[PDB]
């Protein structure tokens, strides 16, 4: 997260989260954090992680 979240605001920005002083600027690199993570959708997990 970069911006201070307001209630009920859709945000579609896939901007590269900068970790420290690494200018990523369109590409990845040294800890260029990609915040758009992924869901674990399997029946292999338990019953509360579904």
């Amino acid at each position: 997260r970069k911006s201070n979240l307001k209630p009920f605001e859709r945000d579609i920005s896939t901007e590269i989260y900068q970790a420290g002083s690494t200018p990523c600027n369109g590409v990845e690199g040294f800890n260029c954090y990609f915040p758009l993570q992924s869901y674990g959708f399997q029946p292999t997990n338990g019953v509360g992680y579904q």
Partner: protein
């Protein structure tokens, strides 16, 4: 212990390999402060990270 939590120089070291946190957030580092730290400093093999 017995020292001001100067977690800034604990964090901004660019000589890292992989930044892995297990129980705490990285945004309130200097804000949130702890009681006592028991560090386990040892050298591992490269495929053990």
């Amino acid at each position: 212990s017995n020292c001001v939590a100067d977690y800034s120089v604990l964090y901004n070291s660019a000589s890292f390999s992989t930044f892995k946190c297990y129980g705490v957030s990285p945004t309130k580092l200097n804000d949130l402060c702890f009681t006592n730290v028991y560090a386990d400093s040892f050298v591992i093999r490269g495929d053990e990270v």
